[PDB]
Structures are given as structure tokens and as C-alpha cells.
Amino acid sequence: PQITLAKRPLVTIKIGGQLKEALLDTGADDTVLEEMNLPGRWKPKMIGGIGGFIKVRQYDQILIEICGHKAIGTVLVGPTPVNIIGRNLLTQIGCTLNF
Amino acid sequence: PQITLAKRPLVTIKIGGQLKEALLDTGADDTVLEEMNLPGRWKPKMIGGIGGFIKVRQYDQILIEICGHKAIGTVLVGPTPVNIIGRNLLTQIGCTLNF
Ligand SMILES: CC(C)[C@H](NC(=O)[C@H](C)NC(=O)OCc1ccccc1)C(=O)N[C@@H](Cc1ccccc1)[C@@H](O)[C@H](O)[C@H](Cc1ccccc1)NC(=O)[C@@H](NC(=O)[C@H](C)NC(=O)OCc1ccccc1)C(C)C
Ligand SMILES: O=C(O)c1ccc2ccccc2c1Br
Ligand SMILES: O=C(O)c1ccc2ccccc2c1Br
Ligand SMILES: [Br-]
């Protein structure tokens, strides 16, 4: 689809057997989700944003569906107040910015 | 243009008579610039993200040119490590997400 930006670009995703809303975020290198269970023995990882760094869990090889486009990749899980879809997945589903 | 997302979407901008680069950020409601001087009245504001919170100076009616496209709006100035172009300005240049 084509998504204007008058509102937050929230879309529905499926991950870890759960339907969720997430923000399509061109300003995120990585994908960071609110607290949830995912399979795998995670590795620690640091990410930073406005306000500072947080240590999160990195899960590799995770399946995710973003508006029905399928993807597999690394997902981070930690204390983010909003589910964020980052560029690592955005490229996979062929998402571009256009003007 | 059409920007793919294998790298961060950093583009050339002009603001306050200065050439700078900024991130086109669909995950930001607001526009946030690295610490700089701007003339005129401003209000203290606070914004949230991943790291938690920062304090910023809010300026209204600021002109930024973004890849040759004018936008004018509210801009926040504070301790960000990257200049961020938010949705308030991205709409004005007709920027959309496409997949
Ligand atoms: C989501 C993160 C992975 C992302 N960070 C990154 O991509 C960084 C660069 N990458 C990274 O860390 O890579 C790992 C690494 C570490 C070390 C060395 C090398 C590599 C990020 O925070 N990106 C932000 C930009 C940034 C980057 C670095 C440093 C400072 C700022 C926004 O672009 C991004 O689009 C977020 C998305 C978001 C939305 C909502 C909540 C949290 C995050 N927006 C924002 O922070 C914006 N906030 C908003 O639009 C609003 C209004 N705030 C909000 O909703 O927050 C409420 C809140 C309050 C209190 C606590 C928590 C939340 C913003 C710039 C104004
Ligand atoms: O859980 C699902 O329904 C599901 C089913 C098949 C998938 C295939 C590829 C990526 C995600 C997938 C997801 Br998230
Ligand atoms: O980008 C330009 O076209 C331009 C051209 C000439 C300039 C001369 C002085 C300062 C900025 C300038 C800029 Br910002
Ligand atoms: Br304040």
C-alpha cells in the first residue's frame, strides 16, 4: 500500500503467534518490540534513542508478517513503549520513502 | 525521489541558513534538531523516546528545505545525536511510505 504520514504509520503485524500493532519507522536501524516471549536463547544488545540507551534481547531468525508480507530476521524485545518496525524488516518487504 | 532503506535515510537539508543532514523519520511525530542557535521566542518542552526523555526548546514557524522541498512548522532543538525530520514536516513535502 501507500501510507501517508498525517497520522502515525501503524500497521498490523503477526509475531510469536500474536497479532499486534506496530509503527513503520524509517528512523529505526533495528526492529524493537514490547515485552513478549519468542523462541531462542537470546543475546544481549544495546540500542539507543532520544533519552539514552536500553539493553534489550536479540532474537535471530524470527518469522514476522507485516501487513501480510512475510519476513524472517532479527527482532529485539525490550522496554519500548511502542512496537517498532525498523529498516532491517522494511527493506525485506520492499518499503521505500517517496516524494 | 525514492529512497530505499538499506542505509539510514539521511538527506541534505537547509535550516537557519545552514546546510545540514537529517534523517527522514516516519517514527517521529515531531522534528528534532541537534543543538544550535536560532533567533526568536521559544518554549521549553519535553519529548519522549526509547532512551526515556529529553528537554528541548520549541520554535514555531521554522522553515526547512528538504531535498529542495519547503516545509514550515514547529521544530524542537536539543540534545539529539541526529537531526530528525518528523511527520509534521514530512507531510508537507508529500512524503509517503510505499510497499
Ligand atoms: C527505535 C530505535 C532502534 C532507534 N534507534 C536507533 O535506530 C539507533 C540509531 N540504532 C541503534 O541503537 O543501533 C544499535 C547500536 C548501538 C551502539 C552502537 C552501534 C549500534 C530510535 O530510537 N530512533 C529515533 C531517533 C534517534 C536515534 C538515536 C538517538 C536519538 C534519536 C527515532 O528515529 C525513532 O523514529 C523513534 C521511534 C519511537 C516512537 C515512540 C516511542 C519510542 C520510539 N522516535 C522517537 O523517539 C520520537 N518520539 C516521538 O515521536 C514521541 C512523541 N515520543 C513518544 O512517543 O515517547 C513517549 C515515551 C515517554 C517516556 C518513556 C518512553 C516513551 C522522536 C524523535 C520525537
Ligand atoms: O504465525 C503465523 O501465522 C505466520 C505463518 C506463516 C509465516 C510465514 C513467514 C513469516 C511469518 C509467518 C507467520 Br508470523
Ligand atoms: O545550496 C545552495 O544553492 C547555496 C548556494 C550558495 C550559497 C552561498 C552562500 C551560502 C549558502 C549557499 C547555499 Br546554501
Ligand atoms: Br517543559
From Swiss-Prot, chains A, B:
Record region (Dimerization of protease): 1-5, 49-55, 88-99
Annotated ranges, domain Peptidase A2: 20-89
Catalytic residue list: D25 (for protease activity)
Task performed by this protein: Aspartyl protease that mediates proteolytic cleavages of Gag and Gag-Pol polyproteins during or shortly after the release of the virion from the plasma membrane. Cleavages take place as an ordered, step-wise cascade to yield mature proteins. This process is called maturation. Displays maximal activity during the budding process just prior to particle release from the cell. Also cleaves Nef and Vif, probably concomitantly with viral structural proteins on maturation of virus particles. Hydrolyzes host EIF4GI and PABP1 in order to shut off the capped cellular mRNA translation.
Subunit structure: Homodimer, whose active site consists of two apposed aspartic acid residues.
Protein name: Protease
Residue span relative to the full protein: 490 to 588 of 1436
